[PDB]
């Protein structure tokens, strides 16, 4: 239905590898150095790189943007400068790969920028998109990782807790918060935190303060605050920019 941006980026990157590989006299950079033919190469070069390894790295999803890709490519050039010298014929050949890469990247600049933003929404110009992405990660990577948290991952099931919704008027759970995040309900940490805190408050109301349910929700809330603290600078900036628009 929708295009997969890493599937797309990787194809664009691999086709740039294909074009560099087709450039004249580039074969020494096609595969990793064989030390039996390139004397003491690995004693001299600490971080070897070559186009086959670069392609394998693309296929491992190692490059979410053009910059990490270009870094490794440029390392091919650096390594030739160190081993053979900056004006050696091989260094100019490697430089010719990097120059063709730079041309190809410039030609597709705009497409690459959309892909990189889709792959990493922190790069998105839309501040609400970035903010929501952060909140989503806090929920999936931190809150949902809390041990013993499974019953908080979905709404309480009245088949298993028949009384629950007779006591609790405003139920809340982590899946519902994620649905809220995906709809961009939250423009600031405060409205996000009102929903997260509601999870704990409901467990206090329904179970009491000494319940396991309450200790688990307390930990969920705690990692949520701990995590938002870690990201304070970026979230503050994003909050400020969402309020401007």
UniProtKB/Swiss-Prot annotation:
Residues 1-245 are annotated as: Interaction with ASF1A and ASF1B. Coiled coil: none annotated. Transmembrane segments: none annotated. The Bromo domain mediates interaction with histones that have acetylated lysine residues at specific positions. The second domain also recognizes and binds histones that are butyrylated and crotonylated. It is found in: Nucleus. Phosphorylated by casein kinase II in vitro. Component of the TFIID basal transcription factor complex, composed of TATA-box-binding protein TBP, and a number of TBP-associated factors (TAFs), including TAF1, TAF2, TAF3, TAF4, TAF5, TAF6, TAF7, TAF8, TAF9, TAF10, TAF11, TAF12 and TAF13. Interacts with TAF7; the interaction is direct. TAF1, when part of the TFIID complex, interacts with C-terminus of TP53. (Microbial infection) Interacts with SV40 Large T antigen. Belongs to the TAF1 family. This is Transcription initiation factor TFIID subunit 1. It is linked to Dystonia 3, torsion, X-linked: An X-linked dystonia-parkinsonism disorder. Dystonia is defined by the presence of sustained involuntary muscle contractions, often leading to abnormal postures. DYT3 is characterized by severe progressive torsion dystonia followed by parkinsonism. It has a well-defined pathology of extensive neuronal loss and mosaic gliosis in the striatum (caudate nucleus and putamen) which appears to resemble that in Huntington disease. Intellectual developmental disorder, X-linked, syndromic 33: A syndrome characterized by intellectual deficit, delayed psychomotor development, delayed speech and language, and characteristic facial features. The chain holds residues 1398 to 1642 of 1893 of the full protein.
């Amino acid at each position: 239905r929708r295009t997969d941006p890493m599937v797309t980026l990787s194809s664009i990157l691999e086709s740039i590898i294909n074009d560099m590989r087709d450039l004249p006299n580039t074969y020494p950079f096609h595969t990793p150095v064989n030390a039996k033919v390139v004397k003491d190469y690995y004693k001299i070069i600490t971080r070897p790189m070559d186009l086959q390894t670069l392609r394998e790295n693309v296929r491992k999803r190692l490059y979410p943007s053009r910059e990490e890709f270009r870094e490794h490519l440029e390392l091919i050039v650096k390594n030739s400068a160190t081993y053979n010298g900056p004006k050696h014929s091989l260094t100019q050949i490697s430089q010719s790969m990097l120059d063709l890469c730079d041309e190809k990247l410039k030609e597709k600049e705009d497409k690459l920028a959309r892909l990189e933003k889709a792959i990493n929404p922190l790069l998105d110009d839309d501040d609400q998109v970035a903010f929501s992405f952060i909140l989503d990660n806090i929920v999936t990577q931190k809150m949902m990782a809390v041990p013993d948290s499974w019953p908080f991952h979905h709404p309480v099931n009245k088949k298993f807790v028949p009384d629950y919704y007779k006591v609790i008027v405003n139920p809340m759970d982590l899946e519902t918060i994620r649905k809220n995040i995906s709809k961009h309900k939250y423009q600031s940490r405060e409205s996000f935190l009102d929903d997260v805190n509601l999870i704990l408050a409901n467990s206090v109301k329904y179970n009491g303060p000494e319940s396991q349910y309450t200790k688990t929700a307390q930990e969920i809330v705690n990692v949520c605050y701990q995590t938002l603290t870690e990201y304070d600078e970026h979230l503050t900036q994003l909050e400020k920019d969402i309020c401007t628009a």
